Amino acid sequence: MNYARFITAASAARNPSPIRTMTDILSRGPKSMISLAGGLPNPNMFPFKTAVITVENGKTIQFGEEMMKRALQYSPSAGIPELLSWLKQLQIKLHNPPTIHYPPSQGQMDLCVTSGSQQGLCKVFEMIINPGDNVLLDEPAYSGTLQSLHPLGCNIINVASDESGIVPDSLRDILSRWKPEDAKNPQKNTPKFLYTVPNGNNPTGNSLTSERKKEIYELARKYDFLIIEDDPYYFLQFNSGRVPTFLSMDVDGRVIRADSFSKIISSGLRIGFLTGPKPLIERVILHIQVSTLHPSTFNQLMISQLLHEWGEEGFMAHVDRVIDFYSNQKDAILAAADKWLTGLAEWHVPAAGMFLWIKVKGINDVKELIEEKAVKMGVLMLPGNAFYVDSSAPSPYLRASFSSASPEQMDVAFQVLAQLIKESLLVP
Amino acid sequence: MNYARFITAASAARNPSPIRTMTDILSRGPKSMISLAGGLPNPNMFPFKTAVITVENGKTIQFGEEMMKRALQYSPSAGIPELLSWLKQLQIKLHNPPTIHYPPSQGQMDLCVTSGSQQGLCKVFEMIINPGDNVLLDEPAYSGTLQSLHPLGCNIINVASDESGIVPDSLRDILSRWKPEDAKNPQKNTPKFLYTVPNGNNPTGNSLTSERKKEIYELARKYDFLIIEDDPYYFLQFNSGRVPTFLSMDVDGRVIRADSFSKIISSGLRIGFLTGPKPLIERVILHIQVSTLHPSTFNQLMISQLLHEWGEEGFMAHVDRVIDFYSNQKDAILAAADKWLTGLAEWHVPAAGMFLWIKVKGINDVKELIEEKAVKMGVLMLPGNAFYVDSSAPSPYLRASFSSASPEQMDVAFQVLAQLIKESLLVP
Ligand SMILES: COc1cc2c(cc1Cc1ccccc1)cc(NCc1c(COP(=O)(O)O)cnc(C)c1O)c(=O)n2O
Numbered sequence A, B: 001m002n003y004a005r006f007i008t009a010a011s012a013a014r015n016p017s018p019i020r021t022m023t024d025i026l027s028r029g030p031k032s033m034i035s036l037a038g039g040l041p042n043p044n045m046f047p048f049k050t051a052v053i054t055v056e057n058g059k060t061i062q063f064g065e066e067m068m069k070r071a072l073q074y075s076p077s078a079g080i081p082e083l084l085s086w087l088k089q090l091q092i093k094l095h096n097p098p099t100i101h102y103p104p105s106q107g108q109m110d111l112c113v114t115s116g117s118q119q120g121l122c123k124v125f126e127m128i129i130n131p132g133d134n135v136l137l138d139e140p141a142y143s144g145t146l147q148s149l150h151p152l153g154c155n156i157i158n159v160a161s162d163e164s165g166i167v168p169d170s171l172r173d174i175l176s177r178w179k180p181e182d183a184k185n186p187q188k189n190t191p192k193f194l195y196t197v198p199n200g201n202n203p204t205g206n207s208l209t210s211e212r213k214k215e216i217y218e219l220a221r222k223y224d225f226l227i228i229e230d231d232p233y234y235f236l237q238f239n240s241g242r243v244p245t246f247l248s249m250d251v252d253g254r255v256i257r258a259d260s261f262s263k264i265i266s267s268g269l270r271i272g273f274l275t276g277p278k279p280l281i282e283r284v285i286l287h288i289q290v291s292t293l294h295p296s297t298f299n300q301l302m303i304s305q306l307l308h309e310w311g312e313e314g315f316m317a318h319v320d321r322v323i324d325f326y327s328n329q330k331d332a333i334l335a336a337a338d339k340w341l342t343g344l345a346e347w348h349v350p351a352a353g354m355f356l357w358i359k360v361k362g363i364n365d366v367k368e369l370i371e372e373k374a375v376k377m378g379v380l381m382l383p384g385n386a387f388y389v390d391s392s393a394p395s396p397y398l399r400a401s402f403s404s405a406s407p408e409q410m411d412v413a414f415q416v417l418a419q420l421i422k423e424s425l426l427v428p
């Protein structure tokens, strides 16, 4: 594979820090080595000295004097080595990528710690997109990806979706406007990638099947496009065995996968990870190096100490307690919507995630009902407009989150909504 | 002032999160309000429960159950409100900007917390630069800004400098190729900004005087460019007492100032702040929103609790303790270089910062002496090549850091260096 067509002139021009290069000779050398190279501060000047963090069902994490100096100090752009080896290990355990032992240039598996999955996704789009480029996704999509894409000046082509996510025949229909050989020609302007959330799509909650994923991968191989697998709900799947990922089937080294610890470990710590082909992961690390330098060494050390003590087993037991809480929350929003919304609205049961996508029966645009009327009543929800490329277009949909609300709060929220849905249909 | 000439088409196209827009109506605000809007996970599912951090000359920072849930949760893109009000307060105390009460559109003072000063600088260059644009800078410069600038495709105009920083007559000579009216014509390609490190420039250690700064500001006003004042050594000045900043004199609202806590509080926590005109700070916040979302809530809470308990007095007692340590380190590298390098090399005494810029007497390029010969001897330093736009150009300079090395390490380093210099002068 040739990654050069997937990287901008700006991204290709990125160079490794000539400072880190000299600094890395220090880490590969003996204790007798003297360095006057790095601009690392003296950590003894830092005011925080020790840290003791308690863990619910787990050993208390302690940062002694030395560990604290390391945690308060600079670290590599890709991430701390202990977090990197544990995450690569996990990707192999879970997804067993075929690329593990490929040569670097051919797209060997590489991983980098990002400041949330959002940072990885952002740096990938900025790496790939030139203004006017064609890009594939299924609308409704995650707003953060729509807000990243909009300033990039690309052409978003919508791929049809149902309850089983992206319809492969819709993808086959869009792709048919180009020839498989048109991928090799830049001027023919073939799509650079396919963006998708294969588990509990934000905001629908729909998941792709194994069969659909295989049809999508064969199409990515045929029209030589990348698959941006943004999977933050891979660990939040409801009443399902884990369907293989696009990374698990990545024989070509054409999948960039974004994983998030935001729903399972911490949203505020800003720790996510990006898995993909080494030439592309490298371009992302070089952009991180000039922006954030590296993710918080402190937060990485907090997560790495927890993760290492749990094991890939203790981690999974934790994922299971998290799914349990979110299933009970989904059951509660579903009970509330059954009680108040049946006959007034339509919704599919989410497969993964923390959102219910509700279609209002007799209203074309729920924008004023949700932004004006519902707000004035003290009930907040999201209008469907926020999850489309054209936000000016009317939407009969709303997104309801079930993460934090108590059953009794959901009951009050939906009664207000049914009352507001009725006050909108009762106008003769 | 018109900021639209300092904002690219991609930066202007950035929109605030429609999600977050709803999320802020909840903050304003009765307790009776129910939200099903945000995708905020339930923080009771996070495994870390409490934190106890000990402080050097200060109260033990304790994160109770509620504080920990907030610290592990998402927060605003610009930063946590307590850190923001304390930093704005400090900027007023220290710099007293004239823009404090200007209307937003006219460039009112705004501040945002960034993931190090590097993130702020990066997002500012990306906000301003279009390929082929002219930018003013004094070489040698900080490598990280050279590696951010290189992929942006701009033209870096070298402004000459001496021991008192940038020579204002050199800037006056460069600018004379345009007319003050040329800033109104985009096609006349007038420089968009002047980038400066006014205290202890990386790698020289030279500081601008008050008089030079006033001549530079009047030239910035005349040719209507911005001043990107990257001041990470403002709190690390030796035997000087702090010269007024470009922000202190910013009557026009044309200064973007980057401050760093990397040398005073923590390099690894990735917490810095950007102060500048509200329309420009706003464009930076919108880029942060789509990349890192926000800086670590946890790290911000650590810093904010320390800073609020210290006050602007205890913060100051700390920066003076930090200067004290670096002062002694500077006397030690200076003692070592006096002992071994006199007659073999030339150097100026740094005014601020943690680096000594050494010029080797009879060598044109110290690249092989430092990268091959010094490395093989176990002594690491940086070749001068790393701090120039054209790195292929030979440099007789090296950068020696005095942050961490002990006096006895400096002695051994400078002896190796002198012996390597002597051996290199014997090659005809
Ligand atoms: C109320 O505010 C929020 C609403 C949010 C989210 C975050 C905030 C907090 C926040 C603070 C400051 C500025 C803006 C936002 C995140 C969402 N989803 C996370 C997500 C990510 C990023 O995840 P990562 O960067 O945390 O790894 C990547 N891909 C997919 C498919 C995702 O679904 C979401 O749906 N809503 O509605």
Ligand SMILES: COc1cc2c(cc1Cc1ccccc1)cc(NCc1c(COP(=O)(O)O)cnc(C)c1O)c(=O)n2O
Pocket (backbone or CB within 6 Å): A017, A019, A020, A023, A037, A038, A039, A040, A074, A075, A076, A077, A289, A293, A294, B115, B116, B117, B118, B119, B142, B144, B197, B202, B230, B232, B259, B260, B261, B262, B267, B271, B272
């Ligand atoms: C050995 O590695 C380092 C060498 C470093 C620095 C950091 C690292 C750590 C690192 C880890 C991962 C990737 C790359 C680097 C920072 C330097 N200066 C900080 C600085 C900043 C950024 O400061 P901020 O982002 O921390 O606020 C802005 N402006 C000016 C004028 C500065 O002088 C420097 O001189 N050296 O040589």
